[PDB]
Paper text:
ATP synthase is a molecular motor that converts energy from a membrane electrochemical potential into the high energy phosphate bonds in the ATP molecule, which is utilized throughout the cell to sustain its life by hydrolyzing ATP to ADP. Chloroplast ATP synthase (CF1FO) from higher plants has a unique redox switch that serves to modulate the ATP synthesis activity. The CF1FO enzyme actively synthesizes ATP in the reduced state, whereas the oxidized form has a low activity. Our cryo-EM reconstructions showed a complete view of the enzyme complexes, composed of α3β3δγεabb′c14 subunits, in different redox and rotary states.
Our resulting cryo-EM densities imaged after the addition of tentoxin were overall well-resolved, corroborating the highly mobile nature of the reduced CF1FO. All three rotary states of the active, reduced CF1FO showed the density of the bound tentoxin ligand, and its binding site alternates with the rotary state. However, the reduced γ subunit does not maintain the β hairpin 1 structure due to the disconnection of the disulfide bond, and the β strands of the β hairpin 2 are shorter than those of the oxidized form. The shorter β strands have less hydrogen bonding between the two long loops to stabilize the hairpin structure, and as such the disconnected cysteines are more likely to destabilize the structures of the two β hairpins. The reduced cysteines may release the torsional constraint on the β hairpin 1, forming a one-turn helix, uncoupling the β strands of the β hairpin 2, and destabilizing the loop structures of the γ subunit. While in the reduced state, the βGlu412 is far from the γ coiled coil, which has less interaction with the central coiled coil and may result in less restriction for the central shaft rotation. An exciting finding is that the peripheral subunit a slightly moves away from the c14 ring when the enzyme is active, reduced state in all three rotary states. This implicates that the reduction of the γ subunit may have an influence in facilitating the rotation of the membrane c14 ring, thereby generating ATP molecules at a higher turnover speed.
Residue numbers in the entry:
A (entry chain I): 30 to 62
B (entry chain J): 91 to 111
C (entry chain Y), F (entry chain Z), G (entry chain U), H (entry chain T), I (entry chain V), J (entry chain S), ...: 3 to 81
D (entry chain e): 1 to 131
E (entry chain a): 22 to 244
Write the structure that this text describes.
């Protein structure tokens, strides 16, 4: 559970924000421009 | 039973406090 | 006596196998029927007529299966 | 940033500019093309050729033809393609009512096909002039 | 392995997993929702962005399916989405093998009969009420104009659809519990490493498919 | 005894295996006949004639199975 | 008596072998019907009507299996 | 004796298998036959003559099965 | 005893030999439906309505199998 | 004796699995032959000659099965 | 007792013949889905949604079987 | 004895599975041959010739089966 | 005793008939996916989305079977 | 005893299942050959050569089983 | 005894029937992948990436069957 | 005893279930070969090279089965 | 004792039912691969590489079957 | 002993079921190879390489079956 789960916790905190951030950036540049 | 009642209370309350805002 | 067990297993396999074939039969029939309905908006009347005739015939076959199963179940001449 | 597109009526080249996303109403339905499409040479029904200039979505009014997708140099040989939207829908519905009207009087066997094609061209005219 | 109940009598024999799991999951869900809606800005900030992303997801899946008046059922289907989402993640994550219970176990709300049949029953009550609302009060969708045979099968499917969705949730969450329990009972947990990804994917899409399946059936209620 | 019970299982398996094939055959003939009707709506009289002829020959197959099953049920000259 | 066990196995096999065929049958039917309504956005009323008739007949096939299996399970004259 | 039971199982199985194949045989023959009739209704006489020849031959297959079933059941030299 | 356990043997065998059919059918209907969503995404809402009718009949088939499949384990009016 | 039971089971399965294959064979032959006649009715005589030759070859195979069955039934040296 | 062996062998057959069926259904569904994505991405949301829906229904069929499978494996009132 | 029963059952299944596959082969060959006859009447002679050599060698296969099975029947050197 | 032997037969056949379906399922789904990838190198991301989703669902089918067999082997209630 | 009986059963099963496949094979090769001949007759010598070679290899594939069965009937070095 | 016999036969059939599915799966999938490459070489990397992912998933099915077979073989807790 | 009879039954079934394969194998290979012949006779030399090589490899498979059946017949290391 | 016989027959059917599938898979994939390299001579290296990867995964499935066969053959912890 | 009996039956079924796959694969593979040679007379080098390589892969498959049979026959570690 220590290092097993740690890889998917890291995948969450990095990759989930990384895949949310690009779509949020597209919608924010849309609404702002 | 009380699980159904608690689900109903949760959904009404969360709706009112959480959806329209 | 074994004759009743034989009658009921024979009726069960009879109705199962009799429902096997007309399943895919009616499947390809209804598929090509609705494909014709969809390709042409004209002849729904006689398309429905011939489709209904074929459906009544295949369902006559599965009620051949049904009546032999029923004659094995209730009106069994042996037991 | 896209494939070369040339829409060509019999008498002229309508416009040979390149745009991004095209929905090609075939005899098999609508199909979208991409820049760097693998070559598919299809047909085109009396329908709607929508384009996308990557700045705005636009429709093209065509009365049939044929299409070819190549190595990013695609050619669509059409029958009657009027560029963009040159008409307004009021005269379009004035043509729709008269096409459906003359469908009744034109009832002989050849007049069936003739009025039906006139109808499919009036319908694509109005559904292209909606925008 | 112990999934029945424990004898916390309250007028009738009641299941313990049902009570504690559903109560704590509703509690943590409302604790997440309530404390972060106290001070929201007009900009979608840290948690408000996530909550509004969930809510526009529910807006899309409720706008595409039901009809002209899905918005009063958006609370129902959205709390259902959130419940299944967090309960699947809690079943995948929250530790309940180190804690021991003298009479039973405690894994998830949908592991037992009550909190899946309750969802089915509430949806079915909603379908019958919405059908008596949007349609007349004489005969609901049962009435047969075209075919002279479909009259009993109409109420028969209106009876057998909620239990079918219930059995869907059963065959998902009980299977997931079996995966996790036998896969941690194999050996030390060096084996669950690739299986955890598939379990997470299946749990998330299980939440999504339950949401869209509730949407489809309030759509049928509208129809 | 065993003779009558075996006659029963034989009749059931006979009506089953003589009901399966006619299902798929009549179904594919019906589907293609209706697609052809959609292809031309002019000669549906002859279309119907040949369709009913083939459908009735397949129904003759099913009632061949039915009459050997009925001889195995009721009119069994052995027992 | 073994007649009851033969009856329950015959009922289970009747339900299974009646659920095999009509499933893929109605799949073919509904597939070609949805491809048809995909082709034409107009004739949808007759599409739904003919598909409802054929799906009702396929439901009739599977419910034939189910009701003969029910006469096996609950209301059987032998056991 | 076991000879009668083995005989009746063979006879039911025989008529079943001897029916099942020519079923979808005649089915695909009739499907392509009617699809060709709607292709061109000029040759309908020769079309119908050839399909009658082949349908008589597949019915010859199934009545070969039928007559060996009858010879096995009624006029059996052994039992 | 074995005579009662044949009910649960028939239960397992019944659900197994029942569930096979609807899978290929659901797959065919789903494939042609999503191919139609590809071909014409405007009438796709009415196509989804016909898909709701398809889901209704498919779920009807399978759940009506499941009711008796569970009735094998739950309700034994034989014993 | 067991020899007559084995001989009659072999005869019945021989007739069955003898008429199985020629059925689908004759069916495909007939379907593509009639679609050929509908394609171009010019060589109807040659087409009918080859059709009767083919269908008669399949009749020859089932007549081989038929005479093996008749040797097993009537003039059987074993029984 | 051996009743547990009967129950578990019925469970194994149930879950196996369950997992056979809807896999290829999911396959052809997803295959026409990806062909639709390649054809027209303008309804990508609808293709994804119908993909989710129909794959959900297929897994739902398999777990409709699996709930009885686990009732015979793990939580059995018979033994 | 059991050796002659083995011989007769072996000959029955020998002719049976000698008859299964060559039926399908002769069918597809004959149907596509008449398809070619109607396609092009210019290659007619060697169309006939290839049809004859092919159906003759398939007849050589099925008469191979016939002669080995009749060697199992009439002239048995073991029994 | 015998219950463990029957249970492990159930587990082995469960895994086999789990790998039956999803094999050809992922085959057709992934084949259409990789073909439509060459057809459109612009929606490669969405093709990967639907492909990973459906492939993971079929892996979920086989892990359903794998885990019911794994509970038959390791974590079982009866023996 | 049982050894020569097993030998004759093996010979019959061998020739049957060795006769199924080559029939279908020779048939599909013949059909594609005659389609090609109708399409184009220019290499009639070469076409005849390649087709008779293919038929020779398939008849070799079955005469293998035939000579092993003759080694099972006539001269079995065990018995 | 019979427990280890059942265990090894279960493992043999479990690693056996785990193959027919993913075999034709990988076959059709690799065929459509190589056809995609031959139709366009520009997306080789994405073709082969989705290809290898799907192949690792058919091999995931295979290694699932294999690990049940091997834990059945060596680390068998029953015997 | 049982060893030689089992070896002989194994040889018979081995050659049978072997020749059910490359029969249809060589058939489809030769059919596509001759279709390519009459389509493009420009590469007759290479066509026949690949044809002979393919047919020889199918002959290699069937003679592998043949030599193992011969070793089951003549030199059985047990008996 | 019977355990060794069971392990050897398990290994035999393991390699058999493990070898039925990837054969036809390899065939379909390599046939479409050679069709692709016949269509385009540019992408030959990438085609051969990806085909080698996929065909070697198929060989990996079959050698998984082979090593279950070998481990049951040589070193079984039961016999 | 029954060990050697089941072992040689295992070798027979092993070669039989290892011969069904590669035959029915190499058939379509080599057929499409000759078809591609007839598509373009220039890529024959790579077509020959790929065809011989893959037909030798399925040769390797059937000789895996043959070496399982020959390890069971010649070098048996048990008997």
């Amino acid at each position: 559970n220590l290092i097993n789960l740690s890889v998917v916790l890291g995948v969450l905190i990095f990759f989930g924000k990384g895949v949310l951030s690009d779509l949020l950036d597209n919608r924010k540049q849309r609404i702002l421009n | 039973p009380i699980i159904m009642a608690e689900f109903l209370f949760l959904m009404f309350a969360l709706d009112k406090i959480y959806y329209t805002p | 006596p074994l004759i009743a067990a034989a009658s009921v297993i024979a009726a069960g396999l009879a109705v199962g196998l009799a429902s096997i074939g007309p399943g895919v039969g009616q499947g390809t029939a209804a598929g090509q029927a609705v494909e014709g309905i969809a390709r042409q908006p004209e002849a729904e009347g006689k398309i429905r007529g011939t489709l209904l005739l074929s459906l009544a015939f295949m369902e006559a076959l599965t009620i051949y299966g049904l009546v032999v199963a029923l004659a094995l179940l209730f009106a069994n001449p042996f037991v | 940033m896209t494939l070369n597109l040339c829409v060509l009526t019999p008498n002229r080249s309508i416009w040979n500019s390149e745009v991004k996303e095209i929905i090609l109403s075939t005899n098999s339905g609508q199909i979208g093309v991409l820049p760097n499409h693998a070559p598919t040479a299809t047909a085109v029904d009396i329908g709607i050729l929508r384009i996308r200039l990557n700045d705005q979505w636009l429709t093209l009014a065509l009365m049939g033809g044929f299409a070819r997708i190549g190595n990013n140099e695609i050619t669509i040989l059409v029958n009657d393609a009027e560029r963009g939207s040159d008409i307004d829908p009021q005269e379009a519905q004035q043509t729709l009512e008269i096409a459906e009207a003359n469908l009744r009087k034109a009832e002989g066997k050849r007049q069936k096909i003739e009025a039906n094609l006139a109808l499919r061209r009036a319908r694509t005219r109005v559904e292209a002039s909606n925008t | 392995v112990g999934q029945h109940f424990y004898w916390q009598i309250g007028g009738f024999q009641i299941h313990g997993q049902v009570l504690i799991t559903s109560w704590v999951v509703i509690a943590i869900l409302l604790g997440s929702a309530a404390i972060a809606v106290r001070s929201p800005q007009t900009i979608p900030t840290g948690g408000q962005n996530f909550f509004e992303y969930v809510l526009e997801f529910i807006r899309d899946v409720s706008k595409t399916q039901i009809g002209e008046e899905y918005r009063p059922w958006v609370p129902f289907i959205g709390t259902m989405f959130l419940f299944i989402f967090v309960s699947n993640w809690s079943g995948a994550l929250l530790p309940w093998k180190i804690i021991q219970l003298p009479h039973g176990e405690l894994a998830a709300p949908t592991n037992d009969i009550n909190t899946t049949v309750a969802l089915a029953l509430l949806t079915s009550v909603a379908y019958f009420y919405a059908g008596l609302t949007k349609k007349g009060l004489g005969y609901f969708g049962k009435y047969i104009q075209p075919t002279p045979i479909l009259l009993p099968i109409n109420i028969l499917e209106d009876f057998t659809k909620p239990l079918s969705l219930s059995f869907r949730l059963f065959g998902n969450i009980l299977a997931d519990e079996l995966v996790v329990v036998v896969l941690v009972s194999l050996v030390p947990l060096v084996v669950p490493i690739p299986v955890m990804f598939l379990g997470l994917f299946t749990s998330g899409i299980q939440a999504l498919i339950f949401a869209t399946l509730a949407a489809a059936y309030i759509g049928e209620s509208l129809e």
